[PDB]
Amino acid sequence: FEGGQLPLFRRLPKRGFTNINRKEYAIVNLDQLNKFEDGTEVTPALLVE
Amino acid sequence: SSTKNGRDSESKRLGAKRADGQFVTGGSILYRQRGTKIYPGENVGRGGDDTLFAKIDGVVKFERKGRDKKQVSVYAVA
Amino acid sequence: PKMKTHRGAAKRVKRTASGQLKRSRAFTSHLFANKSTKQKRQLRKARLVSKSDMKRVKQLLAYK
RNA sequence: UACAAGUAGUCAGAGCCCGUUAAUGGGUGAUGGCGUGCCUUUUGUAGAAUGAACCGGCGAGUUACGAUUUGAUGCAAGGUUAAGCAGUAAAUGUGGAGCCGUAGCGAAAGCGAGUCUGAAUAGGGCGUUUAGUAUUUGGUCGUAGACCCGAAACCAGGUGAU
RNA sequence: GAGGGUAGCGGAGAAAUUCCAAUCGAACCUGGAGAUAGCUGGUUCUCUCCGAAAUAGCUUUAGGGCUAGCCUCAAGUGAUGAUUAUUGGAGGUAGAGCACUGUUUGGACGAGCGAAUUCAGACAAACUCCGAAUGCCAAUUAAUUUAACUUGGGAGUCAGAACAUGGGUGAUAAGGUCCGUGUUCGAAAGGGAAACAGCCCAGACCACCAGCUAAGGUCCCAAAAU
RNA sequence: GACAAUGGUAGGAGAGCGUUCUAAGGGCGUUGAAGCAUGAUCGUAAGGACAUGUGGAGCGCUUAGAAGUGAGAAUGCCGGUGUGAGUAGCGAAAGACGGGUGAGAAUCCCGUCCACCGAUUGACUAAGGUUUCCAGAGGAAGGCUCGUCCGCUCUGGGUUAGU
RNA sequence: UAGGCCCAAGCGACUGUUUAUCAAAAACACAGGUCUCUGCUAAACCGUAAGGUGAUGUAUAGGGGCUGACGCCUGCCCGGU
RNA sequence: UCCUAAGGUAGCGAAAUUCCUUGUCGGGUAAGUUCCGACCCGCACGAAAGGCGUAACGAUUUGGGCACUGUCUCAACGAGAGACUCGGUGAAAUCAUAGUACCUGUGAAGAUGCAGGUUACCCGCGACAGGACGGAAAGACCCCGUGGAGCUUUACUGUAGCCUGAUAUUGAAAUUCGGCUUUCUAACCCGCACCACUUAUCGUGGUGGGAGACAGUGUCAGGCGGGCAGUUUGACUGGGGCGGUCGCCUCCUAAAAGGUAACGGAGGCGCUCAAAGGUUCCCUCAGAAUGGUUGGAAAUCAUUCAUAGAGUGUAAAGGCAUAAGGGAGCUUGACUGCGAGACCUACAAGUCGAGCAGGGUCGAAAGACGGACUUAGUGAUCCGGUGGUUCCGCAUG
């Protein structure tokens, strides 16, 4: 906006903060594991490959 | 010279928000008023400010509360 | 070059799953003796940015 | 063409002079009807509101990097390269750091097809569509002078008492 | 007369904002620099379909913006749209009336009695014992018709005018000014009103030396009845 | 075939004309290319051909690609040419005649008369200008007219210090 | 070739200066008056450093403000600045 | 008699000053808003931004006389230069194209070009100036722009300079209570003298005098500071200025749904209540007449009529006698987490709400209670303060 009345992002308050030590995990579902044959070992070294 | 008038207030929007014989839900506003101009009938309540709302689902009927008196009712039709 | 992001807007909204924006409420900073109990209970629930305002500030938050 | 009141044309039309990209042809015009230039700006202009003497040349939405949307094409729970190396300043191989999507909710710890609020999914909010991704034609926006021409002014460094 | 000095955030002035190279309320040249301009002007080829607005809110705002209304293109849902015919309903305008609050005319009523009581006759946007014609909301009801709604790309508009009608203001003045409701112009050529945007009739795809009509007309200009 | 629709400012959407360059394919041209002029020709529009004159060496056609791609207006910029119009003016002032030169004479040379300044229109010199000074030739341009003339053109010359 | 004169009034005493190019005046200046600062590396001013003017002067001398020949004079108020 | 620091002295006065005003009287002229002399009722003279006078002076401003005259009654004639005809040479402003009449109308409201009528054969030359809203100058007057520049001040924020204190350069001795004051010389200073570099006192060095831990200079702090610099100084408005207004609530205008303007017509609000809230019981007003120690037959005693004319905390409207009006008992629901649906609406906001769960008050019970008969009593964000908390907290606690 320019001039005029107060902008929308000026009449609303700020909310929350952010965490420096935030951890994010890569999620793998059960259905995605059907590719590997039964009776085999699954390792993070194998899911990436 | 000058003047001493010119002030006013924003117009409040009262009246009948529902028509006679119209299906309404369980919280619809039927009438907005100051004081009592239309009395609550069956399945009709009253608010803080004098307003009429339905309690159940059905048609809206405006009836006669004797002489020079009025009421609105809601009947559980279908 | 690269388009810049409104830093003030990034401190007030968050993007939902369907691309909408989740905002907070106003009129809650002080002067709480001049408001009814029902008013203050219902001012603690978050809202969504309206479609009219969305058409105006969509370019401001493009990397968010 | 020297009795005539004209935005100068158009429609109708005798008379006179010629003969074509050969077609129900060309040049001129005694008379009759209709008819107050063009552009800009305005509620409204023949306007006595602005602009142009005339002719010729030059004279104004473009490019780079990002965002979104539409169409085309390749692959598909996957899609795809960057800098660098080789190669003709060459269009092609290598290069998987990286980026988007496949899962959301919460200020956060955190939980997870379910999360937050809440004593209590008791109710309510946002999710469970769980098909995208790389390039490119067109439309629009942002950062750069950003469609073009036009100030009264400000700052810095110098030149002047013929 | 000749040779010299004082330089612009500065000099000189027996003082006028006077002079400093025909220029001075702050000299000239070159750079920042294509300064900024919510302001005037200009913006180059041709055809087909559709087609506005001059409004509300906010605004250091009033000849500028933003959101909403109205226009256009594409993809979606599928009677949800408009007009009539029959019932139901909310809402006190025109008119009328004096039962309330106020105004007022003339007679009986001593407590001065045209109003402390009574009988007749009048007035009112901020009076009502009463109360239309229209307009408005619905039915899940019947004939006719063709539109409505949602999500996305792109806009323009925020100076309006006249006429008819209900009002305020003015002076029952204005081609005056501000509101409600329609038509036209705006953005509409053709015919009538002598000429004359808004009045009356009527909405131009192109061509013809064909016919019937509207508004207004038929003695001559000038087509039609002396 | 049958029906229905097609006035339009701001503005939205679609199909097209023309100019310059590039790739590929295929053509024309000294028995005459582009450009220029005329014509009574063709398509719904922007526009496309053919013939004849001039011209003297390059240029179209088809499909794609790219853009410094289209002009009547901005008191627009540059060049050319009109109207005012044979109109205003030709910058203080006294000339007349005879003889020559000459293609050409009111305006050039020679002689006579008249006229004007004379505390200056006379004689020197400082600043400033830099060859405008002299002789012999010339008449395009300069001279607010003419010119055989010139502070104008050509060719040659000219400034001498112990005070 | 070579002064027109006279009688009254307002302003400024006078001789002088000023808006080159629409104002020459009652406007500025002026001799005189008054107040105030300055004891000398003086006060005042430029540069705000050196170095200079004042001044190669010394309170009968310098800078600044206001009035403006000459004659008669110049009253009251120290709350406010 | 009131107030103040005291209330204008001497002089002058329809004045370079007097709106009313051409004030009143006298003089001057046949006739005098101008001129001179007096009066004082000085809108609004006044004593060094001086008062009252004054010989001489002035291309200064005013009023009246003599002489003179073409300044006029009232114009006429003559000379020269331009103008006019011929020969030579030869521009400019302006310009949409032009075969360019008048009257009455019409029109963006003042026509060569539009309607009706009336006049007028084609082309030149010398003259005049009514129109072509005639030609040069993008109106300096008025208004607008969140445009410039110069100037002022007790507008705001700064600053050049100036004043004051602490500290370093900065030493050495003594007095009553970490210091004040008084002495001394080596630091430092002298546009103070003599000597040398040097025929120069600019400079440097040396020798004598003066002042002296003072002054001058560096860093930090307080005060004065239009001398100077950068900016601000609102909008609506029957042009602008002046006056008035700006947010909220209740009526009329407003055309019986909702909405609807004007510097149109009327009023309020920026609170209050600890019971003036909730629940359970009980009750019905104002006014009029009559009677008795007569104050308004209405200051209280008593009777009758009396559907509202009374009350409802505060303006108005809509309501309320099933009371929402008056009285009494108990009590704190003027609670916590929510909330299907709906009204209004550009957004941000605003309004009502049945029901679910956790504590409860009153009532025998069904039930009522999330402030007051309803509608005004209110201000986004940023920043800061206080109380609580499974939250985070930059290698680790």
Chain C residue with Cα closest to A1: C56
Sheet of strand B51-54: strand arrangement: B29-32, B51-54, B44-46
Residue B2 lies in a domain: no
Chain C residue with Cα closest to A18: C11
B71 touches B64 (CB < 8 A): yes
Contacts of A33 (CB under 8 A, 6+ apart): A42
CA distance B11 to B30: 19
Q: Which structural domain range is residue C57 located in? A: 1-64
Residue B49 lies in a domain: yes
Q: Which structural domain range is residue B76 located in? A: 14-78
Contacts of C33 (CB under 8 A, 6+ apart): none
State this model's resolution in angstroms.
3.0
Burial class (CB in 10 A: 0-12, 13-18, 19+), A11: exposed
Q: How many domains does chain B have?
A: 1
Separation in Å, CA of A14 to nearest CA in chain C: 5
CA distance B56 to B70: 20
Q: Which chains touch A (3 or more CB pairs under 8 A)?
A: C
CA distance B64 to B39: 10
Q: How many domains does chain C have?
A: 1
Residue B1 lies in a domain: no
Strands B70-75 and B59-64, by their bridges, are: antiparallel
CA distance B49 to B33: 8
Residue A10: strand, helix, or coil:
helix
